[PDB]
Amino acid sequence: PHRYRPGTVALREIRRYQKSTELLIRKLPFQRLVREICVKFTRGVDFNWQAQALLALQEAAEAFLVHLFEDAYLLTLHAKRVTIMPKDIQLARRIRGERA
Amino acid sequence: PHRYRPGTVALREIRRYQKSTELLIRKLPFQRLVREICVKFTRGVDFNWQAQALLALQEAAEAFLVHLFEDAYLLTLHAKRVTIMPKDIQLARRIRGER
Amino acid sequence: RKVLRDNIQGITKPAIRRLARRGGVKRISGLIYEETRGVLKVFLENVIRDAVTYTEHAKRKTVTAMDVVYALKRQGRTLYGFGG
Amino acid sequence: RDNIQGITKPAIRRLARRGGVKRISGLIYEETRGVLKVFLENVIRDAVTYTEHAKRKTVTAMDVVYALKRQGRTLYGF
Amino acid sequence: RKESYSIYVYKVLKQVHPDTGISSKAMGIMNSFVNDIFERIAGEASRLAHYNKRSTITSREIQTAVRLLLPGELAKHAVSEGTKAVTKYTSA
Amino acid sequence: SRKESYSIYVYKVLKQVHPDTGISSKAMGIMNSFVNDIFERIAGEASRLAHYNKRSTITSREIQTAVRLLLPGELAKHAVSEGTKAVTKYTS
Amino acid sequence: AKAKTRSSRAGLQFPVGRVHRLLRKGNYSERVGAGAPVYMAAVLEYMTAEILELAGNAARDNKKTRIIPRHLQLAIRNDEEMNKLLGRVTIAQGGVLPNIQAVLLP
Amino acid sequence: KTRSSRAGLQFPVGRVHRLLRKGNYSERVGAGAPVYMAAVLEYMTAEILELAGNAARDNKKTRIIPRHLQLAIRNDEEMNKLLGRVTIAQGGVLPNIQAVLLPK
DNA sequence: ATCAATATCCACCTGCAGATTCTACCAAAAGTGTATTTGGAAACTGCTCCATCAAAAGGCATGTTCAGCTGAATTCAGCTGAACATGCCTTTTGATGGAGCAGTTTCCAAATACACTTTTGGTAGAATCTGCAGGTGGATATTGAT
DNA sequence: ATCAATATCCACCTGCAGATTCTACCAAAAGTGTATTTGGAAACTGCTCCATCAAAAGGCATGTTCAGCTGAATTCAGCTGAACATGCCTTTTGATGGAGCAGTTTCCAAATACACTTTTGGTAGAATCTGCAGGTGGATATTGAT
């Protein structure tokens, strides 16, 4: 039975998703998270969200996560590893200044 | 004959210099470097430097180098090394945004 | 059959792997997905706090895109494409 | 001599010691001179730009504080 | 002919540490700090007034500027003190 | 009623540099964000320049210095060249 | 006598008058000089031109006639200066540069 | 009869008003805005001088020096975050040696 | 290497959603005259900073030796990815009510402008405090050979 | 452990340079009163646009199994970099000369703001136009097994 070696599909997916611009988190789970987080700050009074506000926040959020992955993976290769681990993300965050 | 193990004096120096605030590059080489760089940039016009301008520039450059060393050294420890190397500095710079 | 009780779990494993693939990541530790959810939650909490502050200063109750753009601006990020 | 070489080994090691560096590779010193040169070039270019906007020929401490401000660094004490 | 916040910094210093002095370099640091805090708050308030097409910077924009720029407890305290100062000023 | 933008001018310049090429509305939106961003950066720096020197006028000298502080390298050389040429040709 | 725009007399497409208004309106200074909006408008036009030249080139490489945000993103990040100038700027629906590090390759 | 007097502050309400009008922030400056600003400036100055004096005492010195201000900033979570991109001339750094580095 | 399985690449197509073009009314740029400002020229201070020249003074460059650190090599258990099978969850047009948000008026509390008397905050000297550096000695502490 | 070697800690001390206080007289801001101008809140109001509820329907997520691949752990040899000594050389300190260059006042032309109507040019729908999305297939390229 034909089956690809581990990493071949991974490389194909990297090429795939780097050629595209679509959002990669599903719209509804993300927006449900957003409105839940928002209800915390408001004391329970509820605000509406322009569709463009929700998609603006999702664009910013996805760009942020993708770029954090780029940096963290540089740190991964720097440890002479190939698998991203939480310490790579934590250390990238600390060096960017976000948790320095 | 008495002799310290490699690393004992280095730790002693880390403690010494983290306890102090003095400028660590000597003044005249640094200011000569700045005047050289400035004359180079003005392409032959020469400007004078308030004493406080040279000292402000040195305070900032030293704070910059010290913080670059802290960050790069985090990368050094991350590679499970203890010896800071140029690739640590290069990667720290790429990740901060300075290129 | 397992059902969701935290909304951040709606950020599914495969969505996070797609993000990581866009970041060129080839191999992923299984501990990555909850680390990423934590990071994302903190990012969203800060940006939404600021955007809602911009909303409540305008005596509005609808967060607009410009509220979010201004919030991101105040976190050092400039978002293009929503000033229309 | 060279002016950048006036930034000597022991000075760069003192800086690294303040940064908590315990062991230093012998290649670090030339990398640090490269980095310091780049930093000083940018800060001095902008500071002289500010001076020269004011029709002065003495760069002040405030010109330098403004230069650092325009690359994201806030210097206190001048 | 060259103004600073020194006199005020020293007044507050003597209120919170009466036996404590401050060197001139540390005073320079303090002056930079106050100009920085002022510039930040005023900048954010200016932008708030622009976004809402108002031409007046009021204490409301200041308070929002504080709630956006200071972290957590500092903002909580800072808004308390600003509200109390302005209320106590309103009473002539 | 009205919301003004730079759409018409962006389109004129686009047809000047790629005549058979068009632009989507989302691309047009990010172009408007970009033009507003460059303007705010330049005007902000020009404002600060004028303030440091205790002058109350923003002149082309301030715009030109603001460009030279904010734009990288060759973009700055071209931008001050084009602005200078505009002010010269405008005086007539 | 008939009127010609300030843009007409400066040789530009960007609105000199509107720029002058935006300078007066933004609380940058109590007074705005005559040449400042001319200069500002010229710089905006140049920046727009440069970014549209790069974006149009990306549009042709991907066999499109219409610029989309993706082409603007590729234009930015493939240009050293444009990338440095817009380093902290996110382009909605822009994606990333195709980039795989050497180690990852089979 | 100062505005600072009936505001209960040491920081000069009038001077803040002037710096707001003269700083190109908005065409009009309201009445309560400089009061609130001076109140915040005073509070911020207060907390920072309190912490820096405490550090001065920890080094058994009577005089605040830039080192004490640096320690004040970087030892306080929120100050440190607020002044994260700020350099304190002749302030030095926090003593910190990573655990992996000390012997045995 | 071939040889088969599978995926990605790349071009076709057409209908429609989005883009471009087209038409008109008013906010707003332009024109002219007029009525404040300003930032600059000119002109004598005074700093301030550059150059210099010593000699005191510590710090840098050079050399030698060895500790122990890095980079290489090896193993393995558990972990991650690929592949496939079900079932749910996000997507997707529509509909409707209405909340809430622009758009307009109307003023009135609040801010601005001007011309007044006062209080304060900055500078230059100066007298008078003290805090702390630098130097000494002796008491614990740390490190390293054994 | 034992002890020797070396370093750092802690308590003193007292001047001297730096900080603090004080006197001053002065423009200079800050305060006050008054004479207006205005920006923005309140009060509707028409009207988008946001929330929600419908429940199919496909598009994805989830769970399990199994192959094979990685991160972690361990060893070890060569060599890089730390430690330590000396001696000279570059830096630091202090004064000194004086040139040039900031900083202050003070006119006035020139540049800007203001306020009055005139002309458009830019915006907003509505009416035309067309490039690309999403689906299909054939060819190429890549991969895996041997």
Residue numbers in the entry:
A (entry chain E): 38 to 137
B (entry chain A): 38 to 136
C (entry chain F): 19 to 102
D (entry chain B): 23 to 100
E (entry chain H): 33 to 124
F (entry chain D): 32 to 123
G (entry chain C): 12 to 117
H (entry chain G): 15 to 118
Study text:
In most eukaryotes, the centromere is specified by DNA sequence-independent epigenetic mechanisms, and the centromere-specific histone H3 variant, CENP-A, plays a critical role as a key epigenetic marker for centromere specification. Therefore, we propose that the CENP-A-mediated structural polymorphism of the H4 N-terminal tail is the structural basis for the specific H4K20 monomethylation in the CENP-A nucleosome.
We purified H3.1CATD, in which amino acid residues 75–112 of human histone H3.1 were replaced with the corresponding amino acid residues 75–114 of human CENP-A, as a recombinant protein. We then reconstituted the nucleosome containing H3.1CATD. The purified H3.1CATD nucleosome was crystallized, and its structure was determined at 2.73 Å resolution. The overall structure of the H3.1CATD nucleosome is quite similar to those of other human conventional nucleosomes. Surprisingly, we found that the orientation of the H4 N-terminal tail in the H3.1CATD nucleosome was substantially different from that observed in the canonical H3.1 nucleosome. Therefore, we named the H4 N-terminal tail conformation found in the H3.1CATD nucleosome as the outward H4-N conformation, and that observed in the H3.1 nucleosome as the inward H4-N conformation. In contrast to Q76 and D77 in the H3.1 nucleosome, the CATD V76 and K77 residues did not interact with the H4 tail, and the H3 Q76-mediated H4 R19-DNA binding was also abolished in the H3.1CATD nucleosome structure. Interestingly, the canonical H3.1 nucleosome may form both the inward and outward H4-N conformations, because the weak electron density similar to the outward H4-N conformation was observed on the ambiguous side of the H4 N-terminal tail in the H3.1 nucleosome. However, as the inward H4-N conformation was not observed in the H3.1CATD nucleosome, we propose that the CENP-A CATD residues specifically promote the formation of the outward H4-N conformation. In contrast, in the H3.1CATD nucleosome, the H4 tails in the outward configuration may not interact with the acidic patch of the neighboring nucleosome. The H4K20 residue in the CENP-A and H3.1CATD nucleosomes is highly monomethylated, as compared to that in the canonical H3.1 nucleosome.
